[PDB]
Design a protein around this ligand. Structure first.
Ligand code: CLA
Ligand code: CLA
Ligand code: CLA
Ligand code: CLA
Ligand code: CLA
Ligand code: CLA
Ligand code: CLA
Ligand SMILES: CC1=C(/C=C/C(C)=C/C=C/C(C)=C/C=C/C=C(C)/C=C/C=C(C)/C=C/C2=C(C)CCCC2(C)C)C(C)(C)CCC1
Ligand SMILES: CC1=C(/C=C/C(C)=C/C=C/C(C)=C\C=C\C=C(C)\C=C\C=C(C)\C=C\C2=C(C)CCCC2(C)C)C(C)(C)CCC1
Ligand SMILES: CC1=C(C/C=C(\C)CCC[C@H](C)CCC[C@H](C)CCCC(C)C)C(=O)c2ccccc2C1=O
Ligand SMILES: CC1=C(C/C=C(\C)CCC[C@H](C)CCC[C@H](C)CCCC(C)C)C(=O)c2ccccc2C1=O
Ligand code: SF4
Ligand code: SF4
Ligand code: SF4
Lengths: 706, 37, 107, 139, 161, 80, 108, 29, 30
């Protein structure tokens, strides 16, 4: 009937409100469009990617532009320890006079937002010092987005439309991406660090206006070709050195000091330069090297699911390594953005990993051809699918019964006035690893704690020079490089393990039963997402593979929550130098309820009250805002379609029978949300609320006490 | 009535009453058993 | 309603460990648990758990001892009832515990 | 045919019946003979009184005419109900019984519409029918 | 001293967990009559703490900074009583419950109405299974070696692939 | 409208046909024996997708299958 | 049963009417308190929503001792109005005064 | 910054503003 | 100064335009 949605004529003939909703949902699902050939499909993907890239470019141009225009970067560079980074100005007409005086902070004369994205500490390290270098980044990214947008349009034109064979030319892509995209980019990034980052950290300004004149090393590029590479490991920076000046500055550009710079409490710039140069070489060599693998190549969902899994794993990696090994100057000192950066990337990682299994299940129903897939690894995992699921079921139950059991045991025993009766297991396997890495606290005394061990001496070539810098930081109680752990850390790690196993279980069972089960032998014929199969055969709600992902989104949030809850509380004591609170209260759950949630919410909950308002009124409003939209999701998840469809019918009747309103009419007949729709809408509210509530609390609780 | 006592809820309760009261009497005479000595 | 009522007056149900009010603090967390346990039945549906059980009746058939009473998931109407029971049991007993340990300590 | 007009039963009520969909497109009518003057529930609310008739009732959906038609055969044992769908603002006369015989009874002369010459385990993979106009369930 | 943990007999913090516990009860005993029924209720309560702490000093447990006994599970034979000795104690009792109900269902299924015998428990057949459950580490080994512990995957009900 | 397919495992029990609330199904003569009956779906444009038919089929895994498709005024069960 | 759509849709309207005009007066008051505008919310030092239909019933029930229930020595309770009664050191009963905050919860 | 550098940046941003409209109406067709 | 002009454009005026543009696009037909 109507033209919208263009992608699906069957939705376009639906006379109800369902059409718009489903037309929004089935829009970027290019595969299910009308008449879409394989060749046309791929070219659309490619072009859509250019559009996404441009948005990314515009986004970080908008962060540069707003910081240069409304931030305090120039003021921050002068004293990173005491200057609060400004995100952008505040222009909300609804503000009153006292509220403008509360958000006119960080020494500003306008209301502004204190930034917590860590962009100030990232841009500083790269060599930016003034606002005009920031603005030059924003304009350049504007062009690159316009270069991205034009290219997407360009590669859609007849003469420039890539062939199908080009997109599936796998071997050429690995070589060029590992070589070019990864290798030469990493090599280029080494170029930026030795020619700009390292000079600016030593008080010498190097910009586009002079970089072709000045040299990164006193007599560089004659030792490089003649093989005397060791000259670049000349006199490093002294422990007295103050970042951003020439006092104590050296001249080395490639080193292997290890550890962190004593003032900024972060990695040495010269150390970061060598890393990227080495990494570059590895990728360039590997980039000259180029059944199951054909079914990888014909399914876009298989590739995406593996690419989500690969991104999801390394997204978690970024979070784990940035808090313990700080790579940006003065990022360890601002505790709130370090809290924000870990939480942000861990939640993203949870979505990616869950998404990886989601697109894997889509592959099994729509792309897996079981006749062309026999006697390989894929068709063997489906062959003992019930074994895998049952074992995943056992480990979850095993982990869960006992970790919760110990917590409940400890809680009761602590409630009855007898804390000495708690069951506290020392994390000895972990504490062994810390002693294997050099932490001399537990005294296990083998590998890099034993001073005569082969791993510290290395009598083959006398290599081991990373050891002095590393050992100083891992033994000094001033950072997060292998934090001290105890009984509290043991229990939570098994809770996190419980979360990783149960979340994987839901995703694995959903994928392996996607094509069919006993309750629904022909499930694959109905696609990835369908309501159910009616009340027959006992009942079939939540039987589709999509519903399995849906249930798993609840478990990942819970899992990433327990991860972020743990990281925050532990670091909270560590940042206040009173580690005793976490160590003793985390072994029972009332400690997590009284000394973590209730205790740290004192100021946040007082962002505004009957006596006034402070610079936390936003976070306090957001905190309540999050609770309301979290709870609003429960409505769609608990109450189902039927109640609402019948209720809506009385509203249709009422509208048509009331004068002065009867006169006007809907173009789309009102109907209740769909069965699948409600799950999605409920989960979206739940998960937006889950994150928005924790973000408001995390930021405000840490910013209040530091 | 003895046939009724073999039915699952009542035979599942009195052994749950027995296995509880075993642990109630064990913790009464032998208190605070963390480890095996 | 959150700061001066639910945050401030719940300071005697969470600081109750080590006194005679401790079982209300155990019931406070004990009902927070069962309330959240209800949403496992409310947000989900039967046909997930029936196929999760199909892999668990497999491992009981694998070691040759599966019961002749065939294990089934709860019905749709029952899983609504199991969820609404633990929601009320976990919700009211949270309010039972918060009310009791407050006014015993203050009144 | 429909035998419009026919006496509507002595009802007088039901907010929940036959709104603006009926005047723009596709409302329905059920015609039966009630061999008594008994009260019967409607799909909208419950009463009217069945006439001797020639009884006729205009309903909103085909669902409600079979749900009422199942009631006349259960409680009152009058199985001569005849559902219809109207002229110009409607679509197709004489919806049930389409062959004059009730659909639970076999009748020679009907054709098998929507039959599949296989089981459901013999249905092909959706990857085998990818990027094609063929459907996974159709023969 | 395996993770920086002093033993609890030498821990100065574990002694101060004793000192404030009996001070919280002797102050709780200061208001009552000396011969009353709550008087002997707290004196028996104080002596339960004295049998708690003097048991934990001599047992060879490891106390940390807070002063609580910690368990070392990497299993060493100097710390076998924490997890290793109650671990073997659990598995026999848990395997006795497991091999009884597994052998009960195998005896029940080869009968006329096996479904009612999951409601009603045949006390001869149940006591026959707890006799087979006490010997479960010896009975499951010969059940596995003879091959009747497991079924093949062509005999189990299996979803469509 | 929804699509309702009838597979060759039908035993002509008529249960599905007598479960349908909108009279979408009927029994028709089978030619494989000229003795038994198979279910048919000649009026799928009136199918609301309730799936009452399948819930009445006695065969171990359905002989009649309803695959929900494009929704219409009739299929959404609207009186409006 | 013949006008059940008239009952439900009129009950449907009065829930959304009361949901906005009671709970939204907190969402207004959360937003006015957060935005630094305590003179724009619904309070006793702000736009007042006084319970005058209940404060009148607080007046006709607290003034019935000797007037309309003449043989009663005091009122039906001390909740509507009267003196405070103190047993030991604590209040047994005292006049529960109603205001804008009591108007807000009674419409919740 | 300067006041003229702001209007320079909004002048550049029409080039992604037109090329996004040129791409999105090409992705639509 | 330019904040005072732009944030009611993309806050009020520009969403009123694109909602107007999307609503006519939805309810058009061939
Ligand atoms: C009455 C409620 C209310 C309203 C209407 C606003 C409005 C605003 N506040 Mg807020 N604020 C409020 C209460 C309110 N505030 C309260 C109670 C506090 C605590 C005291 C604050 C604290 C506060 C801070 C700290 C800041 C604001 C800012 C702003 C402005 C954001 C401008 C913008 O870019 O919007 C555009 C909105 C978005 C980009 C987000 C909307 C995303 C949509 C909804 C998602 C769905 C997209 C989807 C495709 C839908 C289609 C959309 C399409 C049709 C256009 C805007 C004027 C910011 C500001 O000053 O900016 C200049 C800012 O920094 N406010
Ligand atoms: C991959 C990106 C990249 C690019 C485009 C450049 C480009 C340049 N480098 Mg640099 N440089 C790079 C990476 C790069 N370098 C890396 C990875 C290192 C560490 C080995 C260096 C360390 C270095 C030194 C020590 C010197 C240069 C110099 C130069 C300049 C002269 C090149 C020549 O004469 O032959 C040229 C602008 C010379 C110069 O004077 O720069 C202006 C110079 O002395 N480079
Ligand atoms: C780069 C990686 C990537 C890519 C290319 C895709 C691409 C796709 N996905 Mg996948 N997926 C991914 C990652 C990715 N996904 C991740 C990370 C997850 C886990 C969340 C999933 C889980 C998933 C599922 C379950 C499904 C897909 C589907 C799809 C397909 C259609 C998507 C669509 O049109 O929905 C339409 C888009 C929407 C409905 C977006 C609205 C919902 C957002 C989240 C609302 C945000 C809330 C609000 C704006 C927040 C405001 C803030 C608040 C404070 C105000 C498309 C092929 C679908 C499919 O069928 O594939 C064949 C499908 O069922 N994806
Ligand atoms: C505090 C509340 C709570 C608790 C204690 C549980 C407990 C459990 N869940 Mg449930 N779950 C919950 C809320 C909860 N859930 C919620 C809110 C949802 C979203 C609807 C789920 C969705 C869910 C799924 C999809 C699965 C579990 C499973 C499990 C079991 C995991 C095994 C174990 O850890 O021991 C365990 C009984 C798993 C299971 O039962 O496998 C055997 C499983 O697959 N849960
Ligand atoms: C699931 C995890 C878990 C584990 C590993 C334990 C383990 C233990 N608990 Mg804990 N506890 C738990 C859950 C758990 N409990 C829960 C859920 C609660 C709340 C109800 C408690 C509340 C609690 C209290 C109040 C006490 C314990 C005590 C104990 C110790 C037993 C001492 C004894 O005399 O038994 C030895 C038992 C035997 C030798 C006989 C075992 C055979 C039985 C009869 C078989 C039963 C099978 C059915 C043991 C270390 C006691 C202790 O001493 O702590 C230091 C103690 O006082 N627990
Ligand atoms: C806190 C979570 C939450 C919220 C906000 C709602 C909200 C509602 N429920 Mg729901 N419900 C919930 C949880 C919730 N429910 C749960 C968990 C269940 C499962 C048992 C249900 C089950 C349930 C049933 C069975 C029914 C309801 C009904 C209702 C509606 C009642 C009428 C009303 O007050 O309208 C007014 C709306 C509000 C007061 C919501 C707040 C709106 C604010 C104050 C104004 C908006 C500000 C601004 C304009 C927003 C947009 C800005 C942007 C566009 C720029 C209301 C929308 C009933 C209904 O639909 O009756 C008609 C009904 O019968 N709910
Ligand atoms: C994000 C964009 C945005 C912006 C920039 C504003 C800005 C404003 N809102 Mg807010 N508002 C918003 C979103 C926004 N709102 C949303 C999403 C909601 C729902 C939660 C609200 C709910 C809300 C309410 C209930 C109220 C406001 C009010 C106000 C004004 C307070 C100061 C004032 O009165 O100046 C004094 C200036 C005037 C009174 C006149 C200013 C210009 C008027 C509005 C238009 C004049 C007509 C003009 C010629 C043509 C109309 C423009 C239109 C076609 C685009 C301020 C202009 C208050 C107000 O005064 O409303 C008008 C008010 O009572 N807002
Ligand atoms: C279902 C499905 C799917 C999905 C899947 C997924 C998504 C996956 C995931 C998975 C994952 C994602 C995995 C991962 C893994 C990893 C690993 C396993 C790693 C390891 C590591 C290592 C081995 C290391 C080691 C070391 C250390 C630790 C230190 C020292 C040295 C070294 C280095 C050696 C797909 C798509 C296929 C499709 C079909 C179906
Ligand atoms: C020593 C030790 C340890 C370790 C442990 C381990 C490492 C283990 C492993 C284990 C494993 C890795 C295992 C595996 C298994 C597998 C399988 C395959 C099984 C099977 C089973 C069965 C078959 C069963 C049967 C039965 C019985 C016997 C009785 C009851 C009933 C039933 C049926 C259940 C620790 C450190 C902790 C501590 C110290 C000590
Ligand atoms: C309230 C509710 C409704 C009624 C709600 C309907 C029909 C939609 C109401 C939404 C209106 C249009 C307000 C939407 C406000 C949103 C902010 C608009 C977002 C639009 C996006 C495209 C941006 C259901 O239909 C339903 C169905 C199944 C399970 C649960 C429920 C359920 O809980
Ligand atoms: C978890 C869950 C299940 C699975 C839960 C089940 C099958 C309940 C089974 C658990 C009980 C506790 C098993 C009890 C077994 C014996 C009675 C134990 C006897 C022990 C004696 C000693 C007493 C559903 O079936 C379901 C259905 C519909 C919506 C949501 C859900 C849902 O959330
Ligand atoms: S409507 Fe609800 S209860 Fe019925 S089959 Fe679908 S999901 Fe299950
Ligand atoms: S499809 Fe099912 S209900 Fe219909 S005749 Fe065949 S077996 Fe009977
Ligand atoms: S889905 Fe419902 S209406 Fe359609 S044929 Fe089956 S029983 Fe009849």
């Amino acid at each position: 009937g109507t033209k919208f949605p263009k992608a699906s004529q069957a939705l376009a003939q639906d006379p109800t409100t369902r059409r718009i909703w489903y037309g929004i949902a089935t829009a970027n699902d290019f595969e299910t469009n009308d008449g879409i050939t394989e060749e046309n499909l791929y070219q659309k993907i490619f072009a859509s990617h250019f559009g996404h890239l441009a948005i990314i470019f515009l986004w970080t141009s908008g962060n540069l532009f707003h910081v240069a225009w409304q931030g305090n970067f120039e003021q921050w560079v002068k004293d990173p320890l005491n200057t609060r980074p400004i995100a952008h100005a505040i222009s909300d007409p609804h503000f009153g006079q006292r509220a403008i005086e509360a958000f006119s902070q960080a020494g500003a004369s306008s209301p502004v937002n204190i930034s917590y994205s860590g962009v100030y500490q990232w841009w500083y390290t790269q060599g930016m010092r003034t606002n005009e270098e920031l603005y030059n980044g924003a304009i350049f990214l504007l062009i690159l987005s316009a270069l991205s947008l034009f290219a997407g349009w360009l590669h859609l034109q007849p003469k420039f439309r890539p062939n199908l064979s080009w997109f599936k030319n796998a071997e050429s892509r690995l070589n060029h991406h590992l070589g070019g995209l990864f290798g030469t980019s990493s090599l280029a990034w080494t170029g930026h660090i030795v020619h700009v980052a390292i000079p600016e950290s030593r008080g010498q300004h190097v910009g586009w206006d002079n970089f072709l004149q000045v040299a990164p090393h006193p007599a560089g590029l004659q030792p490089f070709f003649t093989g005397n590479w060791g000259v670049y490991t000349e006199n490093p920076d002294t422990a007295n050195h103050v970042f951003g000046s020439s006092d104590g500055a050296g001249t080395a550009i490639l080193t292997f000091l290890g550890g962190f710079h004593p003032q900024t409490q972060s990695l040495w710039l010269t150390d970061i330069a060598h890393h990227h140069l080495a990494i570059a070489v590895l990728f360039i060599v590997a980039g000259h090297m180029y059944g199951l693998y054909d079914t990888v190549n014909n399914s876009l969902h298989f590739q995406l699911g593996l690419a989500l899994a690969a991104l999801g794993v390394i997204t978690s990696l970024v979070a784990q390594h940035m808090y313990s090994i700080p790579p940006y100057a003065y990022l360890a000192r601002d505790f709130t953005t370090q809290a924000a950066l870990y939480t942000h990337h861990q939640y993203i990682a949870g979505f990616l990993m869950v998404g990886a299994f989601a697109h894997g299940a889509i592959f099994l129903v729509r792309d897996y051809d079981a006749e062309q897939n026999k006697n390989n690894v894929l068709a063997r995992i489906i062959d003992h699918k019930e074994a895998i699921i049952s074992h995943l079921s056992w480990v979850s139950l095993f982990l869960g019964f006992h970790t919760l059991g110990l917590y409940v045991h400890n809680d009761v025993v602590q409630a009855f006035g007898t804390p000495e009766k708690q069951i506290l297991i020392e994390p000895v396997f972990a504490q062994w690893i810390q002693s294997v890495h050099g932490k001399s606290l537990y005294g296990f005394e083998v590998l890099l704690n034993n001073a005569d061990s082969i791993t510290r001496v290395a009598p083959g070539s006398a290599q081991p020079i990373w050891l002095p810098g590393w050992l100083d930081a891992i033994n000094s109680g001033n950072n997060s490089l292998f934090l001290t752990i105890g009984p509290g850390d043991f229990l939570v790690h098994h809770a996190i393990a419980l979360g990783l196993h149960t979340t994987t279980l839901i995703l694995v069972k959903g994928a392996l039963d996607a094509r069919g089960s006993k309750l629904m032998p022909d499930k694959k014929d109905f696609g990835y997402s369908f309501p159910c199969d009616g009340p027959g055969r006992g009942g079939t709600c939540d039987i589709s593979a999509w519903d399995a992902f849906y249930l798993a989104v609840f478990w990942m949030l819970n899992t990433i929550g327990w991860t972020t809850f743990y990281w925050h509380w532990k670091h909270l004591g560590v940042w206040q130098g009173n580690v005793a609170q976490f160590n003793e209260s985390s072994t029972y759950l009332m400690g997590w309820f009284r000394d973590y949630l209730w205790l740290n919410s004192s100021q946040l909950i007082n962002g505004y009250n009957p006596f006034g308002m402070n610079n936390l009124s936003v976070w306090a409003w957001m905190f309540l805002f999050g609770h309301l939209i979290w709870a609003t999701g429960f409505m769609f998840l608990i109450s189902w379609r039927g109640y609402w469809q019948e209720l809506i019918e009385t509203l249709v009747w009422a509208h048509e029978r009331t004068p002065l309103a009867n006169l006007v009419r809907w173009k789309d007949k009102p109907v209740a949300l769909s069965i699948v729709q409600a799950r999605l809408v409920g989960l979206a509210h739940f998960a937006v609320g889950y994150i928005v509530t924790y973000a408001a609390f995390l930021i405000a609780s840490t910013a209040s006490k530091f | 009535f003895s046939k009724y006592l073999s039915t699952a809820p009542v035979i599942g309760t009195l052994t749950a009453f027995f296995l509880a009261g075993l642990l109630i009497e064990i913790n009464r005479f032998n208190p605070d058993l963390l480890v095996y000595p | 309603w959150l700061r001066d009522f639910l945050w401030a007056q719940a300071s005697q149900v969470i600081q109750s460990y080590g006194s005679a009010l401790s079982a209300y603090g155990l019931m406070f967390l004990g009902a927070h648990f069962i309330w959240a346990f209800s949403l496992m039945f409310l947000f989900s549906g039967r046909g997930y758990w029936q196929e999760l059980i199909e892999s668990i009746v497999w491992a009981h058939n694998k070691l040759k001892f599966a019961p002749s009473i065939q294990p089934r998931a709860l019905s749709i109407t029952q899983g609504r009832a199991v969820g609404v029971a633990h929601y009320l049991l976990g919700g009211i007993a949270t309010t039972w515990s918060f009310f009791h340990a407050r006014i015993i300590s203050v009144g | 045919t429909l035998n419009l007009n026919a006496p509507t039963p002595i009802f007088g009520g039901s907010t929940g019946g036959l709104l603006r969909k009926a005047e723009v497109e596709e409302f329905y009518s059920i015609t039966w003979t009630g061999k008594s003057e008994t009260v019967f529930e409607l799909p909208t609310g419950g009463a009217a009184i069945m006439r001797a008739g020639e009884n006729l009732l205009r309903l909103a959906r085909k669902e409600q005419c079979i749900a009422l038609g199942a009631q006349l055969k259960d409680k009152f044992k009058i199985t001569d109900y005849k559902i219809y769908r109207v002229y110009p603002s409607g679509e197709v006369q004489f919806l049930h019984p389409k062959d004059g015989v009730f659909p639970e009874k076999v009748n020679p002369g009907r054709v098998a519409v929507g039959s599949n010459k296989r089981r459901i385990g013999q249905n092909p993979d959706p990857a085998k029918l990818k990027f094609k106009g063929q459907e996974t369930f159709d023969s | 001293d395996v993770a920086g943990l002093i033993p609890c007999s030498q821990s100065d913090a574990f002694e101060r967990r004793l000192k404030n516990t009996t001070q919280r009860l002797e102050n709780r005993l200061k208001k009552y009559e000396p011969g009353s029924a709550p008087a002997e209720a707290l004196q028996k309560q104080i002596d339960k703490t004295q049998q708690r702490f003097d048991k934990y000093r001599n047992s060879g447990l490891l106390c940390g900074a807070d002063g609580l006994p910690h368990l070392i599970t990497d299993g060493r034979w100097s710390h076998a009583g924490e997890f290793t000795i109650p671990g073997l104690l659990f598995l026999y009792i848990a395997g006795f419950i497991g091999w009884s109900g597994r052998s009960y269902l195998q005896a029940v299924a080869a009968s006329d109405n096996s479904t009612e015998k999951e409601i009603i428990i045949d006390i001869p057949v149940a006591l026959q299974s707890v006799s087979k459950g006490f010997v479960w580490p010896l009975a499951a080994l010969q059940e596995f070696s003879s091959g009747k512990l497991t079924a093949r995957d062509e005999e189990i009900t299996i979803s469509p692939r | 409208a929804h699509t309702v397919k009838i597979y060759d495992t039908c035993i002509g029990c008529t249960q599905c046909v007598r479960a349908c609330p909108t009279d979408v199904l009927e029994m028709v003569p089978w030619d494989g024996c000229r003795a038994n009956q198979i279910a048919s779906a000649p009026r799928t444009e009136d199918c609301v997708g309730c799936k009452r038919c399948e819930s009445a089929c006695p065969t171990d895994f359905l002989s009649i299958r309803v695959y929900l498709g494009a929704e219409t005024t009739r299929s959404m069960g609207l009186g409006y | 049963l013949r006008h059940r759509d008239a009952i439900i849709s009129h009950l449907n309207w009065v829930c959304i009417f009361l949901g906005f005009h009671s709970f939204g007066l907190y969402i207004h008051n959360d937003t006015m308190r957060a935005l630094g505008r305590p003179q724009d919310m619904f309070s006793d030092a702000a736009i007042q929503l006084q319970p005058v239909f209940a404060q009148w019933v607080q007046g006709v029930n607290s003034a019935a001792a000797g007037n309309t229930a003449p043989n009663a020595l005091a009122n039906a309770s001390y909740a509507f109005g009267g003196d405070i009664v103190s047993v030991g050191g604590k209040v047994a009963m005292m006049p529960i005064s109603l205001g804008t905050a009591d108007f807000l919860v009674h419409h919740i | 910054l300067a006041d003229g550098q702001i209007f320079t940046a909004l002048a550049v941003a029409l080039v992604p503003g037109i090329l996004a409209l040129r791409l999105a109406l090409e992705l639509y067709k | 100064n330019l904040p005072s002009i732009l944030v009611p454009m993309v806050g009020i005026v520009l969403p009123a335009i694109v909602m107007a543009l999307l609503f006519v696009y939805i309810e058009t037909d061939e």
